[PDB]
Every structure is written in C-alpha cells, then in structure tokens.
Amino acid sequence: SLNIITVTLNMEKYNFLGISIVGQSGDGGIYIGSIMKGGAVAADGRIEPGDMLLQVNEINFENMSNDDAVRVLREIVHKPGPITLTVAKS
Ligand SMILES: CS(=O)(=O)Nc1ccc(F)cc1C(=O)O
Numbered sequence: 001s002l003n004i005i006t007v008t009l010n011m012e013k014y015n016f017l018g019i020s021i022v023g024q025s026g027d028g029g030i031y032i033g034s035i036m037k038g039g040a041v042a043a044d045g046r047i048e049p050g051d052m053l054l055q056v057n058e059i060n061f062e063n064m065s066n067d068d069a070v071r072v073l074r075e076i077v078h079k080p081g082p083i084t085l086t087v088a089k090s
Pocket of ligand 1: 069070074078
C-alpha cells in the first residue's frame, strides 16, 4: 500500500512548481489537487494529482494547515535553488 518517493527539481528552467494543494492533516493530509502545464512538477512527471505531500526541503507537511502549506510553498518557490518534495503515491 505505502509508496513514498523523494524527487529533486532543479528550478533553473521553471519559476513555479505548478501545483494546487487541497486538504490538511494521522487523519486526512495535504494532497496535490491539480498539476499545471509549464510548471516544474508537470515537466518532471513523477508527482501526480492525488499524491499526498509529506515534506518539502526538510520542512515536514504532515501536521500543517492548508493555509500555512500555501505560505511555505510560496516562500520556498520565490527563493532560488532546487526543491526536494517527498510524497505518498495514491
Ligand atoms: C505561485 S507560488 O510562487 O506562490 N508557489 C506556490 C505556492 C502554493 C502552491 F500551492 C503552489 C505554488 C507553485 O509554485 O505552483
């Protein structure tokens, strides 16, 4: 059942992850609701809608509000450098 992958995106060629996130959390969780064309995530191809977002760049997402998750993602994406996401596959 459990299928967890860690992927690193070098954000050299992209300005945004190109994801929407829904829900919050050992009940519930933060999920990829949608993936947008021209984003780093779509280009990489490994992360899909329905994947649960666990960790971004050693910041844990498992017990975090959706509001705070959006803030953190905006903060991370706006600064230069590779982004490492750990997700649980659907
Ligand atoms: C568009 S952003 O720079 O604010 N980054 C994001 C923030 C929240 C989110 F769910 C996704 C992104 C993104 O880079 O796609």
